Amino acid sequence: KIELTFMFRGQPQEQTAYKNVVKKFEEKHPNVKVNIVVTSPDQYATKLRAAIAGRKIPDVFYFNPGELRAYVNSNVLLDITKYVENSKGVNLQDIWEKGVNKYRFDGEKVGQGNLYGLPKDLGPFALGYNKTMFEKAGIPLPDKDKPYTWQEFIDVCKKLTKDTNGDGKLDQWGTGLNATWTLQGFVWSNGADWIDESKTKVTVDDPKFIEALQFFADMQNKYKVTPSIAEAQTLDTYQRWLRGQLGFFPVGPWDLAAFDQQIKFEYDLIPWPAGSTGKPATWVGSLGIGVSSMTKHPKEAVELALYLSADPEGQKALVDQRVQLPNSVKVAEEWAKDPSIKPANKQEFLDIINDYGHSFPTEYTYNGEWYDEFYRNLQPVLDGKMSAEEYVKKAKPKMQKLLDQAIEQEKQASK
Ligand SMILES: OC[C@@H]1O[C@@H](OC[C@@H]2O[C@@H](OC[C@@H]3O[C@@H](O)[C@H](O)[C@H]3O)[C@H](O)[C@H]2O)[C@H](O)[C@H]1O
Ligand SMILES: [Ca+2]
Numbered sequence: 001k002i003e004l005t006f007m008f009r010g011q012p013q014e015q016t017a018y019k020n021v022v023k024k025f026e027e028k029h030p031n032v033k034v035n036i037v038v039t040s041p042d043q044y045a046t047k048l049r050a051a052i053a054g055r056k057i058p059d060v061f062y063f064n065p066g067e068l069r070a071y072v073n074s075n076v077l078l079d080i081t082k083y084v085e086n087s088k089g090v091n092l093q094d095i096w097e098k099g100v101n102k103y104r105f106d107g108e109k110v111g112q113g114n115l116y117g118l119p120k121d122l123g124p125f126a127l128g129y130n131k132t133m134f135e136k137a138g139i140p141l142p143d144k145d146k147p148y149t150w151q152e153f154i155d156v157c158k159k160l161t162k163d164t165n166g167d168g169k170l171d172q173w174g175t176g177l178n179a180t181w182t183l184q185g186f187v188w189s190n191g192a193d194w195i196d197e198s199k200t201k202v203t204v205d206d207p208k209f210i211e212a213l214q215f216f217a218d219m220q221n222k223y224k225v226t227p228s229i230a231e232a233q234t235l236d237t238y239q240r241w242l243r244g245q246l247g248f249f250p251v252g253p254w255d256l257a258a259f260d261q262q263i264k265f266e267y268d269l270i271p272w273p274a275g276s277t278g279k280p281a282t283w284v285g286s287l288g289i290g291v292s293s294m295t296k297h298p299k300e301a302v303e304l305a306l307y308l309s310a311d312p313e314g315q316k317a318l319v320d321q322r323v324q325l326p327n328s329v330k331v332a333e334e335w336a337k338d339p340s341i342k343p344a345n346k347q348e349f350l351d352i353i354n355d356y357g358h359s360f361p362t363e364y365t366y367n368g369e370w371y372d373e374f375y376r377n378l379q380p381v382l383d384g385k386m387s388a389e390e391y392v393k394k395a396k397p398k399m400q401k402l403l404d405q406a407i408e409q410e411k412q413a414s415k
């Protein structure tokens with residue numbers, strides 16, 4: 001008799017897994033029907049923005065932690081605190097505190113107070129390597145604790161870059177990193193960031209940032225340890241990693257089902273190479289599961305969010321289907337130690353969460369437009385047509401204007 005709309009995003013394997021788990025919810029609650037709206041990850045922001053702009057908000061939906069404050073100011077997210085407290089058996093205290101706190105807001109600041117969502121997951125972005133490739137090449141395996149230096153990383157990547165079938169053409173490469181998702185770790189481990197400590201000033205013109213960005217671009221253009229510009233256009237580097245053509249590529253827990261299906265070589269996880277700080281860095285992602293402030297069925301909507309986020313049955317199903325690591329800390333710790341479940345160094349995911357993982361800079365700001373502007377015109381740097389130094393000088397004032405506007409807009413919307 002009750003109908004809920006559940007809006008979310010995922011790669012094909014994630015869509016299938018969540019659709020399966022929603023069906024399990026519907027078996028458990030036969031009086032609730034869940035109507036699904038699902039998109040690809042890149043489509044999602046646009047489609048959710050449109051829903052909110054028209055005030056036709058789905059009952060339950062994914063959202064970005066960087067939108068939490070804006071969504072509260074505009075009365076988008078229901079305060080679900082009391083529903084979560086009253087629910088049978090639920091124990092959020094078992095869930096990653098880092099995850100739960102991203103969706104708490106006390107009226108002034110994030111991290112404390114009322115719950116406005118539940119964590120879908122934590123998404124530590126690890127570095128994988130192709131063990132099959134290393135062993136066929138006779139290269140000593142990477143250490144699972146001590147990061148490569150940047151120069152050591154380039155050195156091994158060069159050794160891996162070769163013509164393996166002897167037709168005279170390179171057909172295997174050290175790596176092929178996507179700047180959108182992998183620049184951050186090089187920037188951070190080199191002691192830089194997109195913004196200052198106060199999160200109000202753009203700092204991409206820091207020499208440490210420039211060094212990190214130029215190093216990144218140089219992997220393709222100078223050190224030549226990646227497919228060429230044309231080769232990556234022909235077949236993108238994620239696909240080339242699946243086919244066993246690349247030595248190194250990132251791995252998120254959401255990748256595991258796709259990798260189970262398509263990757264035939266042995267791979268394992270390692271820390272990211274470290275810049276001047278000598279400490280590895282990468283991001284820990286998260287999405288929240290929120291409830292529409294205007295839902296006609298808040299109890300059932302929170303029950304769906306809880307089933308996906310915290311319920312041991314719903315959680316076990318998601319972990320079994322290899323699209324995330326457990327939200328329960330104790331379950332995650334014994335998961336990581338189970339050697340029958342690969343990669344062998346699953347533990348690296350937990351090390352990222354507990355130690356060297358950072359948030360995206362936009363998680364700190366009222367909106368992300370300032371950061372999107374950095375990436376919007378970045379490709380000429382990546383393709384060697386413009387220096388890192390020249391680009392960040394040009395981008396910085398455009399970014400700063402947008403950031404200033406985000407800051408002002410928060411002041412206005414929170415009045
Ligand atoms: O193009 C290959 C894909 O890109 C890289 O992933 C980057 C993006 O991460 C996934 O989203 C993960 C979720 O967002 C996190 O905040 C949350 O913790 C996760 O559930 C998107 O599907 C990707 O576009 C990887 O190399 C590969 O998956
Ligand atoms: Ca060849």
